[model samples]
Target: ATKAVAVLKGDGPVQGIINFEQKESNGPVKVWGSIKGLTEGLFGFHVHEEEDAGPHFNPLSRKHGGPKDEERHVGDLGNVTADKDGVADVSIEDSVISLSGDHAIIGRTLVVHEKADDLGKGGNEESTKTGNAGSRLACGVIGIAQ
Candidate 1:
């Protein structure tokens, strides 16, 4: 198995280090991170294209939706919630992202948004394009890890 990492905000008051690991290319990616300085609520998380993180990683050209949606974009990873102390322990297993093989996400971008992702349930055009998730707060490129 291989691992991947993304250091968010390299520079936000909101900072975190997210790690991804998969036992096999067909298995779900196990994700975990300790993010701080959030606003004590939910924040949208997604995998975007490189550079300014162009668009959500929608190779399948699907609508924006939750991590478990049948009609979701590969980038639709839902949200990570912060506690009252402005910290969030991100522990999730995603089937759409991986560190190697056809679904490899290394060199891509990981972005944390300022608000919750509507999960394509917002009933609007914008919702289906980005969950209308407000302002991206941080971003980092995914890299291989030992």
Candidate 2:
């Protein structure tokens, strides 16, 4: 299947690229990226609305939560962790998200968070949507290669 890819660089203790690919599949989208210059701990990662990952990509969702939650938006991908060197690799196969549509990956953002996602089921009001995926350490918009 054809695919599109994008990358972002972190601005912290360590630095690296968050890279991902959009393939033609019905099972799930394939994504992966590496991080560097982090504080040598776990960091939250999610799909954001803005190309720069400014905030959670919950256009309909009103709170912050994990993707597994029904109340959460399709963009609510869970966390990624970095090691002592501030580096981590990410990979996911989500069922709700797609490569086409208004909430598609064609023109969307991949955001790296400064904190870990709480992974709460719901009720926090904020948890129902964003999962409070903290500060944007790095972000980039995904685009089709051809």
Candidate 3:
């Protein structure tokens, strides 16, 4: 198995750990994590392409969608919901990403958003591109797990 991890940080109390795991079969990547210091609601989560984390992680310039969508961005992982205590625990698998080969995600950034990602169903102009997810609350670079 191959694995990677990231330590999230931001100006506010937002912080968390994200992990990615993959097998030699090169199947879907398993993602799991816990985030704290967010409002009690849903938030957008994704893997960004740049270390500076300027734009969305869409290297192919594809539209934004849920993790299971075929026409979505490579970085799209959909939304994570936080509890009343402002903590979110997420466990999911993504088909379009990997730990090696063309879809490797190492060196990219993981971002947590202030608002829920509509998953391209918002019917708005920015929905397909950004899911209209609000400002980024936290970000961290993906690195090899030790």
Maximum-lDDT candidate: 3
**How well is each residue in 1-146 modelled by candidate 1, as lDDT tens digits?**
88888999934688899999999978889999988888889999999977433778887888889999999888778999999998989999988876777757888889999999999999789998999887888888888885
Model 1, position 111, has a per-residue lDDT of: 90
Candidate 1 deviant stretches above 4 angstroms: 51-53
| TM-score versus the correct structure, for each prediction | 0.93, 0.79, 0.94
- Cα lDDT tens digits, model 3, 1-146, are 88999899999999999998988647878899899998899999988888743667777878888888888998899899999999999898877888887668888999999999999999788898888898899989999898
lDDT of each: 0.86, 0.66, 0.88
Evaluate residue 88 in candidate 3 and report its C-alpha lDDT on the 0 to 100 scale: 99
lDDT at 55 for candidate 2? 61
Q: Provide the lDDT at 43 for model 1.
A: 91
lDDT of 2 by residue, 34-107 (tens): 76667666666777777532566666655565767665666777888777766787777677667766667667
Clashing residue pairs for model 1: none
What lDDT would candidate 1 get against the real structure?
A: 0.86
